[PDB]
Amino acid sequence: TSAVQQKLAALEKSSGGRLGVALIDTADNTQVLYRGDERFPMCGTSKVMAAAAVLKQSETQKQLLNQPVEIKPADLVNYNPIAEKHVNGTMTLAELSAAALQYSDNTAMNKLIAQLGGPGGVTAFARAIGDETFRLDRTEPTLNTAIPGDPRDTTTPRAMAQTLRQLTLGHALGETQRAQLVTWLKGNTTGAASIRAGLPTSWTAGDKTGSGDYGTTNDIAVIWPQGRAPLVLVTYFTQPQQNAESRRDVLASAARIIAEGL
Ligand SMILES: CCN1CCN(C(=O)N[C@@H](C(=O)N[C@H](C(=O)O)[C@@H]2N[C@@H](C(=O)O)C(C)(C)S2)c2ccccc2)C(=O)C1=O
Ligand SMILES: CCN1CCN(C(=O)N[C@@H](C(=O)N[C@H](C(=O)O)[C@@H]2N[C@@H](C(=O)O)C(C)(C)S2)c2ccccc2)C(=O)C1=O
């Protein structure tokens, strides 16, 4: 148990919830894990895998990102700030990817999933890039039920950090596709209260949040610290009762402990 791990355990203790953290410091490829091999519900953090899978398809189906996809009134789910503007019209897969990632649009995510042949198509992509842990089982919005002990739509912090590193800094995607994914993550609108809140102001980052029942509050990020090689950081948090409140502050605290421990 390292000093950082002990600090994360203390944070967890005062949160009353269950915290999972995985850091990969690309300066030396070292990792810091806290419940790194335990499963957590991904919620919206799964949107990165779906968007990446579509980017991979676009490497060989060249005009795929410009392909129009019909948005019908029946497609709307619980949160669709971008898709609802286009009901009875169309959005391209690039527009759907940007909406899913940067606005966490759930209808947009469902269109990515459908393009991949269902939730299993997203899992298949994960397996293709060496992630043997990730599993997507349902569409939006039920993939956010986040029931304790339920393996559906979960992953481990270790697996997600390794995957995010491969996708954003490694070669799981072609260069142009990797750059697109990084651009989308850096333009996220929903992350200032989570991991990024715990980082020094001078650092830059891209991230994808997730939220669900059981007060499930998640974030996965690629970070560029001032004067250092980039990091990949995953912070997952989930609570004992279905109606628990969101705790983005716990993710910010975890990120601050990680930054102070570098
Ligand atoms: C089947 C019943 N059921 C299970 C629970 N559930 C969700 O927990 N959905 C979650 C969901 O769709 N979460 C999405 C996600 O994790 O990307 C988006 N992130 C939420 C956020 O950042 O606050 C959102 C409300 C912008 S939607 C949700 C979490 C908190 C508040 C509202 C929705 C549902 O939507 C739902 O219908
Ligand atoms: C000769 C060995 N060999 C080399 C060629 N190959 C593949 O190209 N497999 C591909 C593979 O296993 N693709 C996966 C699969 O077939 O479930 C997933 N299906 C694709 C789709 O539905 O369009 C995906 C892009 C969502 S990934 C692969 C894709 C990306 C990264 C690595 C592998 C093989 O699998 C294979 O057997």
Query: What is the count of structural domains for the chain?
Result: 1
**Whole-number Å distance between alpha carbons of 113 and 143:** 12
CATH number (domain holding residue 242): 3.40.710.10
> Does residue 81 have a cis bond before it (omega within 30 degrees)?
no
The counts of H helices and E strands in the chain are 8, 9
Among the atoms of ligand 1, which is closest to the Cα of residue 212?
A: 8
Cα atoms in the Cβ-side hemisphere of radius 13 Å centred on 192: 4
The Å distance, Cα 31 to ligand 2 centre, comes to: 28
Among the atoms of ligand 2, which is closest to the Cα of residue 116?
A: 22
- Candidates 94, 96, 93, 60; CA nearest to 173 is 60
Q: What DSSP character marks residue 68?
A: E
Distances (CA, A) of 186 to 97, 110, 179, 247, 262: 14, 22, 10, 22, 22
Q: Tokens 């390794």 — which residue?
A: 162
Phi–psi pair at 22, nearest 5 degrees: -145, 120
Contacts for 247 with CB less than 8 Å, ≥ 6 apart: 15, 17, 215, 217, 237, 239
If DSSP codes are grouped into helix, strand and coil, which group holds residue 55? Answer: helix
| CB atoms inside a 10 Å sphere around CB 227 | 7
Residues within a 6 A CB radius of ligand 2: 53, 56-57, 116, 121, 124-125, 128-129
Approach to solving = X-ray
Torsion of Cα atoms, 244 then 249 then 253 then 255, to 10°: 100
Please give the residue range of the domain that contains residue 186: 1-262
The Å distance, Cα 44 to ligand 2 centre, comes to: 24
Resolution in A: 1.5
The Å distance, Cα 162 to ligand 2 centre, comes to: 19
| Runs of H (alpha helix) within 34-140 | 47-58, 93-102, 106-115, 119-128
**Residue whose CA is at the smallest distance from ligand 1 atom 12:** 141
Q: What DSSP character marks residue 172?
A: S
The Å distance, Cα 61 to ligand 1 centre, comes to: 32
